[PDB]
Write a protein of this length. Structure first.
Ligand code: NDP
Ligand code: NDP
Lengths: 243, 233
C-alpha cells in the first residue's frame, strides 16, 4: 500500500507510464503524471481523477522543471517516489545517425534523469525516505543495431543510478532501474505479423510483455518491502536477455 | 604486428593515452595522437617521432574533429584502429553538481565516442576490417559516490559499443571497451584492490593492443576489465 505517498511519473499518457500511474492510484497514492502537451496533461487528470493530476512538462527545459515541481509542491507536497519514464527512440544505423538525434536522446533519456533526481532528493534526504526508479530498457544491457543512441542513454542511467545509490543509501533512499523487454504498446499491435513473430522468436516466454507487468515491478521496488534493494536493475523481458 | 595499419589515439598527451600510442608504435603501426593544446600536440609529435604525429583536437568541437581527420587522411590515410581515450572528470555529490559539470562530462566522454566512431567507420566498412576501442572505467560499472556524471558517461559508452558492434560485426569490424581500475597517473582505495598495487598505464595499453590485434577478431561487444580485482564481472 502507498497510502500517503506522493508519486511523480513522467510521461504518463499511455502504455507503461499510464499503467504505472494507474497502479499507484489504486494503491492509495497521490499520483502526478506528466505529458509533453497540455492536452495530454488534461487527459492524465481525467483518468487520474481526484487521486491525482496531470501536468505539462518538458524534461529538456529547466524552466519547465522548476515550474512543475513547484506546482507539485503547492498543490500536493514533496515527492516521495519518483518514476522516470520520459523517453523516446530516434532509431538509425550509426552511419545514418544525425547529431540532433544523438543529442535529443541524451537530453531526453539521460540528462532528464540527472535533473529530476537532483530536484527531488533534497526532500527525500531530510525525510530519511525516498524512491528513485527509472525505466531503462533491455537495449541498455544487450545493445541493438540502429539504437546506439538509445542504448547509450539506457546504459548511462544505470551507472548514474549506481553512483546516486552509493551517495544516498545510508539515508533510506534507494535508486533502481526496471529494464523492460518487448512490451505490447499500440505501436506493437501496428506492425506486420511478420514483424511481430520476429521479435517473439527471441523471447522464451513466447509472448509480449504487458505494460502493467512493468508497473508491478515498479510498484515492488517502490514499496517499503524493498529498502535493502538499491543500485539494482530489475529485468522484465520474459527471458529475452538473462543477467 | 601492426605493419601497414594507421592508429588514432585521442587524448595521448600523457598517462594511459601516451602508453597506448607508444605501444602501437612499438608494434609496427603509424600512429596519430591528439591533445587539446598545440602545446601537448607537439609533445605527441615528439615522442612518436618519424612514425607518428600529434594534432590539437577538441572532441567537443565538430570543426576541430573534421579538420584533424582531413589532415590524417591526407598525410597518412584511412584510419584502421580508433582508440577513444579523450576523457575528463568533474566530480561532485549530486545535489552539488551544477548542470555545466554534467554537460561537460557527457559531451567529452560520451558524445566524443559517437562522433569519432561514426566518422571512421565508413572507411573501415569499405576495407572490411576495423577496430574501435574506447577507454572506459571501473566506475562506469561499479558506480562511485560523487561521480554520477562520469559513471553515466562511462556506462553509456558500453551501451554504445554493444549496439555498434552488432551493426558492423559482419563486416570485419569489432567494437570493444577496456575498463581500467586504479591506474597511477591513498591506501584507502588500495584497500579495495585485491592486487594490493596500482595499475600501470602500459598495462591498459597491453589490453588495448590485444583487442586491436588480428588475434582478437572474434572479440566484439566486450568490456575487458583491468582493475586488479577491484570489481569482478
Ligand atoms: O508511443 P510514443 O508516441 O512513441 O511515445 P514516445 O516514445 O513519443 O514518448 C513516450 C512517453 O515519453 C514522453 N516524452 C517523450 N519525450 C518527452 C520529453 N522531451 N519531455 C517529457 N516527456 C517526454 C511522452 O510524452 P506524451 O505523453 O506527450 O507522448 C510519452 O508520455
Ligand atoms: N586515471 C584513472 O585512474 C582512470 C583513467 N581512465 C580514463 O582513461 C584515460 C586516462 O588518461 P588520463 O591520463 O587518465 O587523463 P589525462 O590526464 O591523460 O587527460 C585525458 C586526455 O583527455 C584529453 N582531453 C581533455 N579534454 C578534451 C577535449 N575537450 N577534447 C579532446 N581531448 C580532451 C586531454 O588532452 P590535454 O592533455 O590536452 O588535456 C588528455 O590527453 C582518461 O580518459 C581517463 O578518464 C579510466 C579509468 C580510471
Amino acid at each position: 500500500s502507498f497510502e500517503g505517498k506522493i508519486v511523480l511519473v513522467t510521461g504518463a499518457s499511455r502504455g507503461i507510464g499510464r499503467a504505472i500511474a494507474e497502479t499507484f492510484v489504486a494503491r492509495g497514492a497521490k499520483v502526478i503524471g506528466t505529458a509533453t502537451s497540455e492536452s495530454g496533461a488534461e487527459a492524465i487528470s481525467g483518468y487520474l481523477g481526484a487521486n491525482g493530476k496531470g501536468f505539462m512538462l518538458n524534461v529538456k527545459d529547466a524552466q519547465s522543471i522548476d515550474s512543475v515541481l513547484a506546482s507539485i509542491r503547492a498543490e500536493f507536497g514533496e515527492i516521495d517516489i519518483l518514476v522516470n519514464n520520459a523517453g523516446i527512440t530516434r532509431d538509425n544505423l550509426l552511419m545514418r545517425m544525425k547529431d540532433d538525434e544523438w543529442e535529443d536522446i541524451l537530453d531526453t533519456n539521460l540528462t532528464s534523469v540527472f535533473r529530476l533526481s537532483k530536484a527531488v532528493m533534497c526532500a527525500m534526504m531530510k525525510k530519511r525516505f525516498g524512491r528513485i526508479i527509472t525505466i531503462g530498457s533491455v537495449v541498455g544491457t544487450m545493445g541493438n543495431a540502429g539504437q546506439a543512441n538509445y542504448a547509450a542513454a539506457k546504459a548511462g542511467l544505470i551507472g548514474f543510478s549506481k553512483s546516486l545509490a552509493r551517495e544516498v543509501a545510508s539515508r533510506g533512499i534507494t535508486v533502481n532501474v526496471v529494464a523492460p523487454g518487448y512490451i505490447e504498446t499500440d505501436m506493437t499491435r501496428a506492425l506486420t505479423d511478420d514483424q511481430r513473430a520476429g521479435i517473439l522468436s527471441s523471447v522464451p516466454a513466447n509472448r509480449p510483455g504487458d505494460a502493467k507487468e512493468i508497473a508491478s515491478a515498479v510498484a515492488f521496488l517502490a514499496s517499503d518491502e524493498a529498502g535493502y534493494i538499491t543500485g539494482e536493475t530489475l529485468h522484465v523481458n520474459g527471458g529475452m536477455y538473462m543477467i
